[PDB]
Ligand binder design. Structure first.
Ligand SMILES: [Zn+2]
Ligand SMILES: [Zn+2]
Ligand SMILES: [Zn+2]
Lengths: 64, 73, 78, 84
């Protein structure tokens, strides 16, 4: 299925059993890749090639 | 003067006193808990064991001003 | 080769290996340069922790039921 | 003024220091065993901490940090092999 490991304020990582909504990894054995530099606190949809995962990042940081 | 270094689904990293032996970080959900990190050089601490998608409040005092963090969902 | 070392620390190393067809999981075997093999079974990436800094280690991953050398970091004074 | 190595990788080193108060900032100096000194300035004093990247795997490095103005010294060797 789909697996997400590291959800930060800035990133989310995905792992599939290679090419998000509020890139291309040409393998060869790269089962995973990590998106970088996105907006904290946002809902998302991720799909890899069915099937999709929904993600929310986390506000806030530095500082308040 | 407190900074939130990293926010994860289950953890938070914090960075931030005169004649301080150690520091006590207190945190609560939206249940107060407190863990003290001894050492003046202990200027950072990572709080683990947090629930994903939950709002936390963090404050550190030497042994104002606090910060709020929401974990991933 | 087919097995690569992504990150190396004084006390840990992370490894990634190509998937095998029709396999329920993998057994990673590692040893010191003495040395006696130790294996950890993970049902395709894993980080082996609890290692001694500044020493040469050997790692291999095996399909079940049927490679790479790593040196950790060294530093003074701390 | 102790100087601490929090994390060491094949290509990077993490350092933390006491840092005398109040420093306008910090300068990190490093050199390989045979190589030349290189200097990086960190505007303090928020950060008693810094991560040095871009190092060669399996290399001897020497580090010392000075408050600015204008110390504590540490020696580091990184790990090998990676690749493959
Ligand atoms: Zn939702
Ligand atoms: Zn040496
Ligand atoms: Zn070697």
């Amino acid at each position: 299925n789909l697996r997400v490991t590291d959800v930060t304020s800035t990133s989310v990582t995905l792992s599939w059993r290679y090419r998000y909504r509020e890139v291309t990894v040409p393998g060869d054995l790269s089962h995973r890749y990590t998106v970088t530099g996105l907006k904290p606190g946002t809902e998302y949809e991720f799909r890899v090639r069915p099937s999709s995962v929904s993600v929310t990042t986390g506000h806030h940081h530095h500082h308040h």
